DNA sequence: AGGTGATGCTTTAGATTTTTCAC
DNA sequence: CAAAGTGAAAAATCTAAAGCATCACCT
């Protein structure tokens, strides 16, 4: 009560005062002032009437740095509805139950989206209780929440006005996001603050021209821990060595001396022309002295921005550790607090780190977002290395090393933070009014979400409640289904194996198919001409020229379509599809409609120029219960009680059971009862079900999203302009020119970078649970449609060439020598005097034109006269990325199916431009494995003939496993220790999953045979092991012999692995007697299968290397075709009679 | 309005099974004639032929010229449903939508009746050559079956010849290679055990071995086995069933391409 | 303590091989008149009543009546050991600890010994409820158990049709339908296969067909099995062995979906 | 000319049969005192013999000694072509690179050769240690083979102990524990169903059981194995052919720490 | 020495479950 | 009291559904 308000009330102030301690003064003079935000938290100041009230805080700089910050206070609310007609009495009773808690209580209407007569000009009324503090919030929600539950409770079964109320929601997003739209305050942009006394709220303003922006001050630190081998690093057990830090280009370095041998000067790190740091070195005779020293750096700093990846789990419960041995208070000193969910969110700071965006926003391979793979990848360089086992050694014996290791690290800290994350941020501030740390570790879906609310807001609709996952559903049978999806992502590759665009390959084309392009080639031109850049053909002057240029090449192809000439690797690539679809025929949530409520709908004529017959089909996975024996088990569950959650509480009754528990016991009895009892418990079939979607909406997505591509494609267009401005300008040399169009040139390719990752985005947000807008139709009909689309392309390429893989988005495929694939239209317009067109895109765009006009596109010209002006619209525009050398398709090991979703390849000089799907960009589980894929994936790129290339794949796999057919006698044991350690992480405790058996309870249970049940007592262990052979009749799963039994001495240790062993008789016991090559040689035997064997077997070649097998499903076919005696049709011995038909009998 | 009833359920129990693994849908057909069946495989190689004299069956009332296309499988499943010694009656209708077989017991109380939807489909039908053919054996049934049962798994290609000694089926594969020659029979009364040859040129082909092994599962439906064929001809391997009809089949020979020279 | 032996071997071996599967846990109440087997099955519908009396055994002794209780599936793996006419032989304790069970050969050379680790439950004592059978029938196991796999593969729900005349089983399948024809048997000399039927009123009950699959493998307890039912009610399967005792299967009739009208 | 006329069948197929889960490849040496078999098993913890001597054989033509190998599955799927009843005969060649075998049928008419491309192999051959053995169980293999794979059911590993008292063939399992008795024979007249051990002292010892089952399989050659063992020794399961030869398994000991805690 | 089916002994394809990746 | 997972791999292990090699009568 009180002592919680005096808790909160001190609380306040130690951070007010912790606050004022860094800058950031409390503006409480009247006047206006420039300002440039750079953050936002929520606190609680005092007001002008004694009340404990809560508000957040903006921060902002400006261009000199002028550090300031203001304090915005508004009631915080959330929107309820009820029945018509119980609208009054509840805000009256609401009103005098939540006095104290409630400042008003207002009636808001609010826009539906789903609800019948849908968007006839009825909105529904909502009540809006506006209140004081977050925390009364948390407790009238928790209030309520119980209340309407069993409120929607009896709503789904079938007074108190308490029970009337029937939705809470924006619950679970908290009061940030919905004052960020509130106010419409976006953050990171130059705005106009005004104070004008403590009775009148601080006015904000948004300044738009000023696009020019300075750079807040940064601190990179580089942590660098010496780690005993065998041990966890931890801050208990060592101490540090040194830091170093960026601010702004100019860097520092702190280096404690008390184990550091030698006192170190200033470093520079200039591997690249517009790459530059200069330091400054301070020494530290004690460790003491190092923090503080860096505290009082970071005193005068005034800092906002301190950045390293990995903080919140190795640097900042590592510092507080620190501290707490020498006793230095943090939370006094910065401030920085483990948050709820596991982090440090500064209240005064900015920390970011880039695994939150290397690793998941770069769409860059997963398994190589470290940072040297992160520096090769951008900067193109990558730094130095240390083996985090012998660096502490490596430390004593010489520190500069470390010194180079730490500065070079912290620069290119820096440099992929401004090359890229002040981009993101900037880019993620642009609309989104969200605080940077939960933009990057809050998904894109929930980035989707962000929008959805901020044009929501601009719609003025209701934020749809997020919904909860319902068990026990039922069909139109009523039959229990066990898990819902769609008919999935249709990823299928036709053929594979090695495709190296100089290396050639055989063609087997259709002229007729030829000719049928021929007749509409200059259709093809004009289409691409006045659709792609909007430019008539009256402006072209050599049309005339390429057209006969093409007829030339395109007979060159038609005269011998079965050839051997240089395959030409295009992909068939589509980003931005799914938005791109739902652009053309306006999809969205909830006008989602069946038919009974589309004739609810007023625009069922029968000139259906608005119902579009969209199909689709949905996978059932079920379980096979019927109706009548689910009653009678749930009879007998609610005949009698059941064993207690309580511990030792009542006998447990189902009416007063909460649902998950309930869904287990049904899903266990009707799992094991149907398991006696019907053969099986999942049940798949793909049903087919045909469902109509409205069109005359706010669409709010849909405009949403339309907006938001032609603003991609102008950002992307003066991206374009002003680099060749800033090109020029570099010819010219004029500073504050040069400079000012490096922030014009960064500010468009932040915005393009922004987009392209929101529309990797769209499409993400349905398939997820307690969202606004959960659907099971809408991904469904858009992959439906592009289902048709790659289906119509794979029908055409597979007249006109070789589709390689059907992906979703992209098509990669293989296009002859000679087909038309680019060409430029010299025009008299001046604005574009050459018009460059690619011919394949172009065909298939007037394809999926003519196949796909969407005539239904109806616009809300007059919202007065309600006019929906009905047009067509073509925007399905397909691009081919640049020419690719290589291309590599992997396939799997059974009969007639291959590997999905799993390929790579090359660029013309070979870089590693994309590579994804396999166990080298996965981590843990077997490492080795993933040598050899970097091994041969390095090898692939040379050769100029497939022969030799495959030779030199097998020279590589020959090297890596006569490595370990020859038990690596001459070679030392430590790498052979980091290749075979397999590790499987503990999820729960050794005790819990109990008579489970696996490899790593079984590692469990040894470890607790080893070293008592200490070791095993949690979950979280890294329970390292490998697999041991010489036990004959044991399950694999046994004999998972770990690798910490090598701490102990050879006495117990080898009593202990005679214990495992069961085999008292050896005497010596190396490492490598004690392998179990089985699992090894059949891992890397899948593994070579699915890489290399399989696809060069499907591509003709005799063998990869002789010391590998094949399953013998192919065997039987390539022995039977490298013979004469082939099979025979039955037309050419047997004469014919003629065809037959059967009819009802 | 059509009946059919037939003594000897057993054969139709085992011929109607041992037609299984090469079609799914058969083309069964019933005329004056009999009932007869020729179906043709899925992987476009081998064809089955059967017929069945009208006084094979006990009563044969065939009304119209009644083709009928159903699946196998189930037919098969519900066929196992009969006894050994059970008699068997087939009964359709000019208009109906369902086949109808009654199974009835020599104790006259084991009596069952099953009712089987009928199907449509379209398929084809391939004429039938008859000419002079180079050899025709008389070989024992479960001799040759049991041929085609161990030679299944010395290889998959199995050549054939046929000469004045008598006939010889010689197969091979990665493992090795085994042959099997046969003599002639002139020192044993019983003509079912006994084998016979004729000539009229060398013969020497070869066949799908592995399409054999899945047909040869007919073994005793006729005591004898008897062949004839000839080269780039039809094989007609064929299986007496007594009077009441007979079994035949045919099958896609291999043949040599030829090579530069 | 508890002793008990037998020169039978065959009886209780196929017993435990008829009751292995359908239930996994069951109690083993013994008392002075002997054990009873009630099993609260798994699949919560089809419910068992096993009898087992004491004046079969050659030897009976015990101190205490123990209502103690083990899986069946340890109980089939130790008496799969057992033959046919070996004599089986069983010693206990007062407490529950560990059981040893002897098998003696009739030639009176090979003996052995076996020990189990026993287990402690609790099931509440379920009451079998005796009442009078409208529709009762002796019917030969054999045949019994043929028409059970004949309808296994064909259909998942077997009507009942007890009549006058006998019973009749249809089924509605996928690939179709059928019926089987029951009736009395009165020329026939041997009794075992003989089918009485007691009626008093026809009993119409759809049921899974491999349920009672499960409970066929006790065929070979005797050639004819006891099978009783009346409206409204499960049925109860009777199966007789020399003067042993009786086994009552309590099945609940699964009626139909009623969802549609 | 590597010659072997022999009327059996059956035998030898069997016995060749009988190491299709224990010996992938071994090792032949066709000699003129005859052929004979010795290795590791697949892992390496037993020994196996067969041994066949010339004056078994018919007629047995060798003049030089050959150590060919082969496939035991490969030749094991080619030795399931002829009868039981077949007559066989085997020869090789000096450039014997594949195995020249004909089964003949006994009428004369049916006559089959086969061959198989054969590999080489090079497994140290070492010396068996002859000596007195304390302990032999010459009790029908039958039995034994029935007993071993009801207590591989339950148990795991075997003890074997033949003491004063008798023979003790104990299993501990994890679910239970089992042990057999048996001790001499003396009211059975016949003496291919007695059991005769001689007795020279008391033995506890351990051994493998799934081995022993693999051994096991190997009965229907003999009526009665012989069981011969001693002190700390792998056992000596002999099965005897017939009089054309012999055959050996040596099971190893299982090495149980005898030292306390 | 074969003809009807039991009866069991391998064999092979799903079934199921648990981490652990990609989206 | 809390917590953004679910299809896909891949195997371990647990299964049943058959394929096929011996037996209960009978001259
Ligand atoms: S498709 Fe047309 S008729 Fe149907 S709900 Fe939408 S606007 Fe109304």
């Known amino acids: 009560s009180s002592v919680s308000a005096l808790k909160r009330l001190e609380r306040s102030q130690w951070t007010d005062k912790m606050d004022l301690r860094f800058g950031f003064e409390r503006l409480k003079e009247p006047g206006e002032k420039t300002g440039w935000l750079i953050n936002m938290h929520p606190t609680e100041i005092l007001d002008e009437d004694k009340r404990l009230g809560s508000a957040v805080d903006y921060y902002f700089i400006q261009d000199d740095g002028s550090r300031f910050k203001v304090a915005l206070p508004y009631k915080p609310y959330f929107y309820i509805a009820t029945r018509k007609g119980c609208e009054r009495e509840v805000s009256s009773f609401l009103s005098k139950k939540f006095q104290g808690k409630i400042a008003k209580v207002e009636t808001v209407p609010k826009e539906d989206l789903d609800l019948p007569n849908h968007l006839v000009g009825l909105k529904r009324n909502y009540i809006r209780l506006s209140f004081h503090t977050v925390e009364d919030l948390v407790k009238v929600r928790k209030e309520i929440s119980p209340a309407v539950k069993k409120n929607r409770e009896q709503d789904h079964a079938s007074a108190d006005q308490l029970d009337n109320i029937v939705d809470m929601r924006e619950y679970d997003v908290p009061y ?22 403590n009775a009148f709220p601080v006015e904000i303003t948004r300044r738009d021209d000023l696009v020019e922006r300075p750079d807040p001050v940064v601190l990179a630190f580089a942590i660098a821990t010496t780690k005993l081998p065998l041990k966890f690093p931890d801050a208990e057990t060592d101490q540090i060595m040194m830091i170093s830090y960026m601010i702004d280009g100019q860097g520092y370095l702190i280096t404690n001396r008390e184990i550091v041998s030698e006192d170190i000067e200033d470093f520079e790190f200039t591997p690249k022309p517009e790459y530059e740091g200069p330091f400054c070195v301070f020494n530290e005779p004690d460790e003491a002295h190092l923090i503080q020293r860096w505290f009082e750096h970071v005193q005068e700093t005034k800092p906002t921005i301190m950045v390293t990846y990995n903080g919140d789990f190795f640097d900042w419960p590592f510092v507080e550790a620190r501290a707490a041995v020498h006793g230095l208070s943090m939370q006094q000193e910065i401030g920085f607090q483990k948050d709820s969910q596991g982090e440090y969110k500064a209240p005064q700071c900015i920390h970011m780190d880039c695994l939150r965006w290397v690793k998941r926003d770069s769409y860059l391979p997963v398994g190589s977002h470290n940072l040297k793979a992160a520096a090769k990848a951008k900067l193109g360089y990558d730094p130095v290395e240390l083996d985090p086992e012998d660096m502490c050694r490596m430390a004593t014996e010489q520190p500069q090393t470390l010194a180079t290791y730490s500065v070079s690290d912290a620069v290119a800290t820096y440099y992929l933070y401004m090359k890229y994350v002040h981009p993101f941020i900037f880019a993620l501030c642009t609309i989104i009014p969200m605080e940077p740390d939960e933009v990057l570790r809050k998904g894109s879906g929930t980035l989707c979400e962000a929008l959805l609310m901020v044009q929501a807001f601009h719609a003025n609709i209701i934020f749809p409640n997020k919904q909860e996952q319902e068990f026990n559903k039922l069909t139109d049978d009523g039959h229990v289904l066990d898990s819902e999806t769609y008919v999935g992502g249709h990823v299928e ?32 031109l004009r289409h691409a001409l006045e659709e792609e850049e909007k430019v008539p053909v009256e402006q072209v002057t050599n049309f005339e020229e390429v057209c006969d240029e093409i007829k030339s090449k395109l007979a060159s192809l038609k005269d011998v379509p079965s050839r051997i000439e240089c395959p030409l690797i295009y992909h068939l690539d589509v980003g931005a599809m799914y938005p791109n679809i ?103 079939k793909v049903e087919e079900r045909l469902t109509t979607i409205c069109q005359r909406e706010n669409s709010f997505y849909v405009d949403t999203v339309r907006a938001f591509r032609d603003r991609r494609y102008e950002f992307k267009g003066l991206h374009k302009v002003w680099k060749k401005k800033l090109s020029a300008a570099v010819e010219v040399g004029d500073a504050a020119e040069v400079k000012r169009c490096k922030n014009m040139e960064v500010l468009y390719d932040s915005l393009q970078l922004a987009h392209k990752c929101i529309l990797n985005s769209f499409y993400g947000y349905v398939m997820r649970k307690g969202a606004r807008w959960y659907s099971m139709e809408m991904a469904g009909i858009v992959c439906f449609t592009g289902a048709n689309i790659i289906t119509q392309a794979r029908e055409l390429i597979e007249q006109i060439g070789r589709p390689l893989e059907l992906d979703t988005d992209g098509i990669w495929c293989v296009l002859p020598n000679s087909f038309p694939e680019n ?46 002006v009905t047009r067509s619209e073509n925007s399905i525009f397909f691009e081919v990325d640049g020419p690719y050398l290589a291309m590599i398709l992997p396939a799997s090991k059974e009969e007639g199916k291959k590997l999905k979703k799993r390929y790579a390849v090359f660029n013309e000089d070979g870089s590693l431009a994309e590579l994804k799907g396999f166990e080298v960009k996965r981590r843990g589980e077997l490492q080795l494995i993933k040598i050899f894929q970097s091994s041969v994936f390095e090898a692939f790129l040379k050769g100029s003939t497939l022969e030799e290339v495959y030779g030199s794949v097998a020279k590589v796999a020959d090297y890596w496993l006569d490595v370990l057919y020859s038990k690596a006698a001459n070679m030392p044991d430590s790498e052979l220790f980091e290749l075979i350690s397999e590790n499987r992480s503990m999820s729960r405790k050794l005790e819990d999953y109990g008579e489970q058996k696996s490899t790593s309870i079984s590692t469990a249970k040894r470890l607790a045979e080893f070293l008592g049940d200490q070791m095993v007592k949690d979950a979280g262990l890294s329970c390292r092991y490998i697999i041991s052979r010489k036990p004959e009749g044991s399950p694999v799963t046994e004999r998972a012999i ?72 192919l065997h039987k076919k390539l022995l039977e075709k490298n013979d004469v005696y082939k099979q025979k049709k039955i037309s050419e011995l047997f004469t014919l009679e003629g065809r037959r038909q059967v009819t009802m009998a | 309005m059509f009946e059919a009833r037939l003594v000897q359920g057993s054969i139709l129990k085992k011929v109607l099974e041992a037609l299984k693994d090469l079609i799914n849908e058969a083309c069964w057909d019933i005329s004056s004639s009999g009932v007869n069946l020729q179906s043709m495989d899925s992987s476009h190689v081998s064809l089955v032929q059967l017929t069945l004299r009208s006084e094979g069956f006990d009563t044969y009332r065939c009304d119209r010229n009644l083709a009928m296309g159903v699946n196998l499988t189930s037919m098969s499943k519900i066929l196992k449903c009969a006894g050994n010694e059970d008699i ?32 449509d489909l379209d398929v084809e039908q391939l004429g039938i050559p008859e000419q002079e053919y180079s050899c025709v054996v008389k070989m024992p049934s479960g001799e040759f079956a049991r041929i085609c049962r161990d030679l299944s798994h010395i290889g998959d290609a199995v050549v ?47 066949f799908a071995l592995r399409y054999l092994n899945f047909f040869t599962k007919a073994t005793p439906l006729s005591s004898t086995v008897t062949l004839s064929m000839s080269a780039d001809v039809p094989l007609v391997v064929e299986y007496k069933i007594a009077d009441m009809g007979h079994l035949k089949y045919y099958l896609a020979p291999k043949i040599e391409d030829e090579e530069g020279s």
């Open chain 1, 176 to 197: 940030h996001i919905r004052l960020s739209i509130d106010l419409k305050i976006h953050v990171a942009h130059w705005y106009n603050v005004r104070y004008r006394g």
């Open chain 1, 493 to 524: 590759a036709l053929e594979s194996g090695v495709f190296r665009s100089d290396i050639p390959c055989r063609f087997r084309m259709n002229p007729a198919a030829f000719d049928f392009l021929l007749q509409r080639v200059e259709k093809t």
């Open chain 1, 582 to 684: 739902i652009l053309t025929n306006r999809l969205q949530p909830s006008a989602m409609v069946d038919e009974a409520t589309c004739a609810a709908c007023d625009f069922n004529k029968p000139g259906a120029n608005c119902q579009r017959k969209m199909a689709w089909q949905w996978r059932g996975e079920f379980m096979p219960a019927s109706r009548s024996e689910y009653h009678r088990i749930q009879h007998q569950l609610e005949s009698e009680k059941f064993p207690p959650l309580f511990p030792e509480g009542p006998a447990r009754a189902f009416h007063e059971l909460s649902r998950e528990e309930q869904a287990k016991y049904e899903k266990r009895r009707l799992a094991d009862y149907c398991r006696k009892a019907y053969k099986k418990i999942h049940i798949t």
């Open chain 1, 823 to 868: 060409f430029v239209f010299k025009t008299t317009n001046v604005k574009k005097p050459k018009v460059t067109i690619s011919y394949p895109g172009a065909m298939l765009n007037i394809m999926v034109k003519e196949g796909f006009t969407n005539d239904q596109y109806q616009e809300l010209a007059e919202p007065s006269s309600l006019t929906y």
């Open chain 1, 1042 to 1113: 770990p690798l910490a039994i090598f701490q102990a001495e050879p006495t117990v240790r080898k009593h202990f692995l005679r214990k495992w062993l069961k085999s008292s008789s050896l005497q010596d016991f190396d490492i490598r007697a004690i392998l179990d090559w089985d699992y090894y040689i059949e891992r890397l035997g899948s593994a070579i299968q699915k890489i290399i064997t399989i696809p060069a077997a499907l591509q003709q070649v005799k063998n990869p290397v002789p010391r590998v097998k094949h399953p013998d499903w």
């Open chain 2, 88 to 119: 068997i009656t087939l009964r359709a209708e000019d208009n109906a939508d369902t086949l109808a077989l009654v199974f009835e017991a020599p104790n006259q109380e084991k009596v069952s009746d099953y009712e089987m939807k009928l199907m």
């Open chain 2, 160 to 206: 054939i010849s046929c000469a004045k000694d008598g006939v010889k089926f010689s197969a091979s594969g990665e493992l090795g290679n085994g042959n099997i020659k046969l003599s002639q029979t002139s020192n044993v009364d019983k003509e079912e055990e006994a084998v016979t040859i004729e000539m009229n040129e060398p013969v020497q082909l070869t």
